[PDB]
Scaffold this active site. Sequence first.
Site, PDB file in Angstrom:
ATOM      1  CB  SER A  91      -0.928   0.011   1.205  1.00 26.66           C
ATOM      2  OG  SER A  91      -0.173   0.120   2.388  1.00 26.66           O
ATOM      3  CE  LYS A 134      -2.954   2.116   5.398  1.00 33.80           C
ATOM      4  NZ  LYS A 134      -2.908   1.640   4.016  1.00 33.80           N
TER       5      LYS A 134
END
Lengths: 146, 193
Positions: A91, A134
């Site tokens: 990611s 996140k």
Amino acid sequence: AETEPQVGTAQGLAWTPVGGTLLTIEVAAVPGSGKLSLTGQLGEVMKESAQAALTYLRAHTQDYGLPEDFYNKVDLHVHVPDGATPKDGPSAGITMATAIASALSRRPARMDIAMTGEVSLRGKVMPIGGVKEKLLAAHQAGIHKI
Amino acid sequence: AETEPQVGTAQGLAWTPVGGTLLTIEVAAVPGSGKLSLTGQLGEVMKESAQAALTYLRAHTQDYGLPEDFYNKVDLHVHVPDGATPKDGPSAGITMATAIASALSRRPARMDIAMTGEVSLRGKVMPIGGVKEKLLAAHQAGIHKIVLPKDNEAQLEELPKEVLEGLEIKLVEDVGEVLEYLLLPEPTMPPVV
């Protein structure tokens, strides 16, 4: 967070089972023969994402102002601080593409934008996991652009 | 401790669970094709610290008087005595940068100053762990000048008050200040071509 736009540096987001955190990716382009050092206790999937980002930028070299022959004149070092913290996952492909393009084209990437996303070889952003942690971690640190 | 300044040698600190210990880092720069030997039975994180410090120095050659093409003309060798004991950790980053710059620029490094800190690729000095044991060992061995990262200033009141009055801590936050404080200004030896 930090305020000034830096050359060869990009802000990204990492997921841990106790929450999110920031990770800074920083690269350096020195004169050399064409190599790729990848340091910072990186796993294999993250190294393969770095190579995918570098291949995408080698295919599109006119569009971003990159030098036309960096593939055998420039050594690249990709460091993810800090050491003694193992880091893995796909990611961080967008962060590495931004950092490598900023280091090769000498244009400062701005550091008040956090980013995340997986990259493919056609340059095509693909979805990730752990979005909520996140974004909360990016909002703790005072970053308001994702 | 050593007294006389040496070329390509730096005085670092380490800690085991027994206590603090002095590290010495030695760097040799010989003619060659551009390689990097790393001996002394080092861990993987410490090898990555050496590679990060070398990549920092390859991008600022005109700032420190390094030869402009050592990346394919010079073979470097980093040795951390002794050969029997294993060594690992990120905390020996600026001492390797000082040793490598002293060996390439042919400028002697002062050996009466201990140092510790983690270097990054932009030349930033990141905080470390185990400040108390390292500074106590440096005070026992006779050294009275310390270089330390800016963010480890909070740990300095873990020390006895009679140790802090004898020491003299310089708090840095980028490696250019370390290289300006440690290296003597005149080159002694002839350069490795």
